Design a protein around this nucleic acid. Sequence first.
RNA 1: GUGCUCGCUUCGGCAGCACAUAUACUAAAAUUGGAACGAUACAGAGAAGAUUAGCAUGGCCCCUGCGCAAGGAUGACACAUUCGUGAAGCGUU
RNA 2: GGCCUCCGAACGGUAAGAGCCUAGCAUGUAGAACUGGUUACCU
Lengths: 285, 149, 107, 38, 55, 34
Amino acid sequence: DFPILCQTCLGENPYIRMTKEKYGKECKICARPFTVFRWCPGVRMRFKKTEVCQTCSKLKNVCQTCLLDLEYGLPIQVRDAGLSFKDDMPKSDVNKEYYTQNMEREISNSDGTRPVGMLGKATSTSDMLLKLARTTPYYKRNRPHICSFWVKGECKRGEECPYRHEKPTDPDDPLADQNIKDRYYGINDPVADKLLKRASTMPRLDPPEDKTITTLYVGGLGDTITETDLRNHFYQFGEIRTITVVQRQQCAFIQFATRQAAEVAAEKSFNKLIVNGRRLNVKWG
Amino acid sequence: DEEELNDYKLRKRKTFEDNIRKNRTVISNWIKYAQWEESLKEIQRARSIYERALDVDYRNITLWLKYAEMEMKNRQVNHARNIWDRAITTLPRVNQFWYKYTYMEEMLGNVAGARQVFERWMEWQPEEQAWHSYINFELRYKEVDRART
Amino acid sequence: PAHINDFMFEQQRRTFATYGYALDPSLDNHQVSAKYIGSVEEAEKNQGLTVFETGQKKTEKRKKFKENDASNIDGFLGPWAKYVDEKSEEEQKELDEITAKRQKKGK
Amino acid sequence: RMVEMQKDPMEPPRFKINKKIPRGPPPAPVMHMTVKEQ
Amino acid sequence: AKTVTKQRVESHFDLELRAAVMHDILDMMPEGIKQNKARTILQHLSEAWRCWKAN
Amino acid sequence: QLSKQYSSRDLPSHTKIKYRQTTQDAPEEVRNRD
RNA sequence: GUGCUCGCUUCGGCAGCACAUAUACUAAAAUUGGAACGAUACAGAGAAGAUUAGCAUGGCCCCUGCGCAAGGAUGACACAUUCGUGAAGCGUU
RNA sequence: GGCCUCCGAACGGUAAGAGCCUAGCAUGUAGAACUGGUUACCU
Ligand SMILES: [Mg+2]
Ligand SMILES: [Mg+2]
Ligand SMILES: [Mg+2]
Ligand SMILES: [Mg+2]
Ligand SMILES: [Zn+2]
Ligand SMILES: [Zn+2]
Ligand SMILES: [Zn+2]
């Protein structure tokens, strides 16, 4: 009873009518019958319905319809590229059936609210994916499918047509093909790969222009801030060597015992840290 | 290589599974399968084989020795440590497990660990020889007071 | 569980669906609640008009031709009356192109 | 609002159950020979 | 849940006799510790039964 | 996953339980007896 | 949409009020991959020398069958010579 | 004083298979991208 859901599926209305079938469909993964839920998300929306059984969601920690993580809204291949691939799960036939069975007993014996072993891992995060995690609901995802009479030029329902009248996606784009099983296991997922390419460009971690340099060239200081903000932020890292301050261009230089600590302060800092409700931007030299 | 080796593995692997399914037990089939995967250094597979064999017959002491041995051969100290603990927990009466367990710890250098193991062992009030081995263990170091105790 | 009067549920659901503003249900939002939960452009303007309650003002009716006597044949339209008003080329092309591409991909 | 979906009474069993997958697998401790006898 | 029947009765009786002896004695006789003559003791059983049929 | 299959044998029969009566030899008598 | 306001008040319009309150696996489509016991081709029935009757046993094998019946090739599947290393533990000279 | 049964269907025979090639059969899915930063002092 009650599905497991994204906030993005469930709807942008707080009031929702949602129907239930006892054994509605096989799950497209572990292939068992399971309680299925439909509901209307919104005014122009599509009537989504749960695609996979609740168990294999608890297993990989995901929405039932979307298969996007609960916290990050990221396809599974991504958050695995983000932490731990070694979760695994047999893809192969009768194994899948077997492992699902056992893991279904293991889950039965848990407190109920926890994605099994992954959650022991799931706490430690934020490497990148937080910064590539999506922020707001994305409703373009629930729109009705593309009317396929109209996309041949004919559709004779006129304005009534609940489907959507517009140009489809060119089958050329590798982002088209998108199997379900595939998106689930984290194989060759085009979306996930795209997000990976997007991850790399994040100006961030390579640093190291020069050896031993712990000099921090800090842009976007501002004249509200004091140094004491700086120190009481940065004593976490280690033994400071010193701090140079310039308020004429509002840039603050810093120096630490080891370069390692400076890299760190970059990492922890870059395009993340803000104090005095004002962004504190960092660069090398 | 790349594909040619692979096919070989399917024929062997499949055969192993067939043998097991036919006879179910007869753990020489289990063991041979484990050994083959060990030889190919697919030791994660090997582990699963050993665990499956244990599910069939957890009392079989050769099986456990082969399992622990496999871990040790591949320098997987902590796996071996786990396994030893399980073996003595479920089949405490088997002295072979205890003798090997203490030996392993001694080789690793963990005298304290070995002492702990022996103290567990002694709770079972075992056999004259076990007590002698514990005393001798102590006497490989000076530790005369311990021995007397 | 909850045991909300069904009728009130309908009132809130339609209110939101139609106008975008419905009073929010929460228990511990502040541990006391003073607030609406809609887009709210309508809510300030429409003063929480309920779907069941008559709207204060009426606007913009659209006509559908009707003959209701039924004496006539073929003639007669009942509540089957097809809105008189409602009977891109630019787009008409992009879609086609996409289709072509898809076909090619099938190859 | 959860509502149970109405089932069509003349609908046959939807899907097929027959498929069979091998029984799943810790043992409690047991706590329980002369040459001539051998 | 197959049900005993005329076709299956003789086979049934000998099946559960082989099992009766097997469980009883291998849970009764033992200390071979490895495998004690199960195939063999049963072959002695069938041998004896033939011998009594031949008087 | 419970099958909609049935069988003749399975159907209701003897749904009532014949409790022993007092002259049949209810447990009450038995407890008291020497 | 229907009716009613001794509604404005003519018979046009407008206003108020009452009644009436949320359908739909939306597609008339598009795509996506397991099975026919077809022919063809190769080959060709357990048990012992052969020819055959069969009941069984076991289940990541099924099928026919309302069936806890019975069938499917017994359904198929089931392949006498003569010792010594290496390490560890225990007792002894 | 009487005295008039039944009545038909199923398998147990045409191989068991392995392979290759070619309609057939189910799905009516889920999902489809993203921005904005400073240098300055003694020998
Ligand atoms: Mg025959
Ligand atoms: Mg048969
Ligand atoms: Mg048979
Ligand atoms: Mg026959
Ligand atoms: Zn599933
Ligand atoms: Zn979802
Ligand atoms: Zn259309």
